[model samples]
Target: VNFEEVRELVPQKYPFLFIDKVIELQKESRIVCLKNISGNEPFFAGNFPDFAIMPGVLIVEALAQASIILFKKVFLLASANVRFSKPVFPGDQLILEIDIEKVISSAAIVKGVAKVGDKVVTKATLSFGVA
Candidate 1:
């Protein structure tokens, strides 16, 4: 799916919507998305000036958003487990990759990672269930 399709599945808006595009998806198994970090981002203004860095929480959010796509596709929505590997900075193009590890009834477990070029920026395991 593309950004437009993703926008429809996830409930996030500008300044908070982290994923810029969805590059790949394999039903409930795996997904790949992108987020282009720019200096113009709102948080950067207060995050720091000389060395602006994307917040670790936002990195997790990006991964969560990708997981949301999988949730919607597989007909589930609720919670997740996420971890960060490294910091993300402005001008970086983040590649988000997620793989569904398990799904049963109304819950799911997914593993995700965010990267810039060949470097890993963050990664996490997410668990979610219907609301």
Candidate 2:
């Protein structure tokens, strides 16, 4: 799926919508999405003009967006436990891999791992509350 498809798949809009494409997806199982980091990103201007780094929280949000798409619902993010291993910079492509841990009518849990090339950038456990 491309950016246009991603926009329709989830509720997040441009500038805030971090997903650029979907590489792999399996309903209620797993998903792999991509985001290309650019020097011209709006956050780059404030994150640091000299040395731009993708915010960790936004990376988590990206994972959440992918999860939301997989869930096929606009679920509220209820919890997250994330760890960052590397700083993401412009010209990099973020690959998000999410695996569903559990899901029900009212809540869900997923494990996410983000990478740049062969290196892991972020790892997270995400929970969403359905309403």
Candidate 3:
């Protein structure tokens, strides 16, 4: 899935929507998504051009977007836990991997990873509650 598809699936918009595509998704088991970092991205202009780094927060957002796929599958929108291990930069392609741990009425626990190529940039355990 691409940005347009993601926009239709989740409640996020430009400047906020983070996942660019869904490479793989399996009901409530796991999901793989992508985020393309570009030099022309709006944030780069004022986020420090000389040393532009994709904000760590957006990394989590990407994960959240991916998780939304699972949330919708289970019919819930709770919360999540995220971690950053490296910086993402322009021209980088971020791969997000999410694994569901537990799912109950209106809540879930998930594990997520953010990577660039084969390098892991971040990982986390996310919890979701109904919204």
How do the residues 2-92 of candidate 2 rate in per-residue lDDT, one tens digit apiece? 7778899889897799999889979889999999999888999998678888889999999999899888835999999999889999999
TM-score of 3: 0.89
- Could you tell me which 10 consecutive residues in candidate 2 have the lowest summed lDDT? 66-75
Clashing pairs in 3: 78-128, 78-129, 79-127, 79-128, 79-129, 81-126
> Candidate 2, which segments miss by more than 4 Å at Cα?
none
What's the lDDT for all of these models? Answer: 0.82, 0.91, 0.81
What is candidate 2's TM-score against the reference? 0.95
**Would you estimate the TM-scores of all the predictions?**
0.88, 0.95, 0.89
> Backbone collision count in every prediction?
9, 0, 6
lDDT of 3 by residue, 23-64 (tens): 987886999988899988898888776898888877887887
lDDT of 1: 0.82
**Alpha-carbon RMSD of each model:** 2.2, 1.2, 2.1
lDDT of 1 by residue, 82-114 (tens): 566678777889999999898888778888888
